[PDB]
């Protein structure tokens, strides 16, 4: 009834689609560094405006900023006492090493790192057709996962938007950055013994059953 885990995958693999499932099943805090940055943007803060430029170019925000953000949420957020799902963090080796140290000092080490494996060619179609409900994070897909009431949140009525970093230009840079900087983290968790791989090219419900299976709960 408690999990401390990391969700790793390329842009469009299905992290934001699966994290609700995990958060419902294990009652864990969902810590998504992308959503945290996007809330800074919506508040119009200075960190938000600087991060927006970097995100829209397909680059990565500084390790120092990202490590500080997570450290404060782990320390000051009460829901993180029940367990947590890290989504989009760590994203570089330095972030992974600093997380390892943090958790060692708190005495709450990671149990699992789930890699969502899916080929790049599929990811373009997923990113191109995405619509998000900006007031929650709810992602839909024009073809693959439609709003029943078009361009509207099926369960909350409000309009869906396109993310500003979801275009072919930014996406090419986001994929290259994933392969260069993030994918090395997978070997880090293989060596520590907590890695499990999942076929993320399957449909959502199939991927969710695969994840439950890989976690050792079901
Ligand atoms: N730690 C960090 N350090 C540095 N910089 C950081 C950082 N964290 C964040 N940043 C920065 O902030 C930016 C954004 O980060 P972030 O917002 O975390 O984005 P990302 O990692 O690029 O991931 P996505 O949100 O694009 O993908 P997803 O897998 O969650 O997709 P979804 O489930 O919607 O699915 C995609 C689409 O396909 C669909 N779909 C999902 N699953 C399936 C399926 N199985 N079959 C068919 N359709 C499916 C969905 O409906 C949707 O349409 C970064 O690029 C960087 O600038």
Measured from the CA of 140, which atom of ligand 1 is nearest? Answer: 51
Name the residue with tokens 């029943």: 148
Give me 197's structure tokens: 């791989």
Judge whether 210 and 202 are in contact, CB under 8 Å: yes
Quick check: is 15 catalytic? yes
Among 4, 98, 126, 130, the active-site one is 130
Indicate which technique resolved this structure: X-ray
Q: What is the dihedral of CA 164, 17, 128, 13, to 10 degrees?
A: 110
CATH of domain 1-218: 3.40.50.300
Angle of helix 63-76 versus helix 93-106 axis, rounded to 10: 20
SS (H, E, C) the chain: CCCEEEEECCCCCCHHHHHHHHHHHHCCEEEEHHHHHHHHHHHCCHHHHHHHHHHHCCCCCCHHHHHHHHHHHHHHCHHHHCCEEEECCCCCHHHHHHHHHHHHHHCCCCCEEEEEECCHHHHHHHHHCEEECCCCCCEEECCCECCCCCCECCCCCCECECCCCCCHHHHHHHHHHHHHHHCHHHHHHHHHCCEEEEECCCCHHHHHHHHHHHHCCC
Judge whether 19 and 7 are in contact, CB under 8 Å: yes
Domain ranges of the chain: 1-218
Distance 213 CA to ligand 1 centre (A): 23
Give me 46's structure tokens: 């200075």
CA end-to-end distance (rounded Å), the chain? 12
Give the resolution to one decimal, in Å: 1.6
Buried (b) or exposed (e) across 158-194, using 16+ Cβ within 10 A? Answer: eebeebebbeeebbebbbebbeeebeebbebbeeeeb
Pairing of strands 84-87, 29-32: parallel
Judge whether 190 and 202 are in contact, CB under 8 Å: no
Beta bridge partners of 197: 115
User: Is 212 annotated as contributing to ligand binding?
Assistant: no
């Amino acid at each position: 009834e408690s999990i401390r885990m990391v969700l790793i995958g390329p842009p469009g693999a299905g992290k934001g689609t699966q994290a609700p499932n995990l958060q419902e099943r294990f009652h864990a805090a969902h810590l998504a560094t992308g959503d945290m940055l996007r809330s800074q943007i919506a508040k119009g803060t200075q960190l938000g405006l600087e991060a927006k430029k970097i995100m829209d170019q397909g680059g990565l925000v500084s390790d120092d900023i990202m490590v500080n953000m997570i450290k404060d949420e782990l320390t000051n957020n009460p829901a993180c006492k029940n367990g947590f799902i890290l989504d989009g963090f760590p994203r570089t080796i330095p972030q992974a090493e600093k997380l390892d140290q943090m958790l060692k000092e708190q005495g709450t080490p990671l149990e699992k790192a789930i890699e969502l494996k899916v080929d790049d060619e599929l990811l373009v179609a997923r990113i191109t057709g995405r619509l998000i409900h900006p007031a929650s994070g709810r992602s839909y897909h024009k073809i693959f996962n439609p709003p029943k009431e078009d361009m509207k949140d099926d369960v909350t009525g409000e309009a869906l938007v396109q993310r500003s970093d979801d275009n072919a230009d930014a996406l090419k840079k986001r994929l290259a950055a994933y392969h260069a900087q993030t994918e090395p983290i997978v070997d880090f968790y293989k060596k520590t013994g907590i890695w499990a791989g999942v076929d993320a090219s399957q449909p959502p419900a199939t991927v969710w059953a695969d994840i439950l299976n890989k976690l050792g709960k079901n």
